[PDB]
Unconditional design. Sequence first.
Length: 36
Amino acid sequence: GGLKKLGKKLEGAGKRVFKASEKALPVVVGIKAIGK
């Protein structure tokens, strides 16, 4: 089954990248927090 293949592949990135995003959450939110 490829389903679990795609859901497990991309997921791997979101786990490592979470550090790249989490760090800019204040920088990604500030826009969503200002522009709502």
